[PDB]
Write a protein that binds this ligand. Structure first.
Ligand SMILES: [Cl-]
Ligand SMILES: [Cl-]
Length: 67
């Protein structure tokens, strides 16, 4: 799972940049005390979450622009 601090810090980083470099993933890994894999998955899932939020709004705006 992910602690209150890990979540807050992962979100802070995510908003700065959705994609990380291998060097950055390492930095994050040591800082948040999560493995490279735990960071890699979190970022993939957080991108998946965003992709869905963007689509939901896109289709809400298409819906609300009728009649
Ligand atoms: Cl906690
Ligand atoms: Cl990553």
């Amino acid at each position: 799972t992910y602690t209150r601090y890990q979540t807050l810090e992962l979100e802070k980083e995510f908003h700065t940049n959705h994609y990380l470099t291998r060097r950055r993933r390492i930095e994050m890994a040591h800082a948040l005390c999560l493995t490279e894999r735990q960071i890699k998955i979190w970022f993939q899932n957080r991108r998946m979450k965003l992709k869905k939020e963007i689509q939901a709004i896109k289709e809400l705006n298409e819906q609300e622009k009728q009649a």
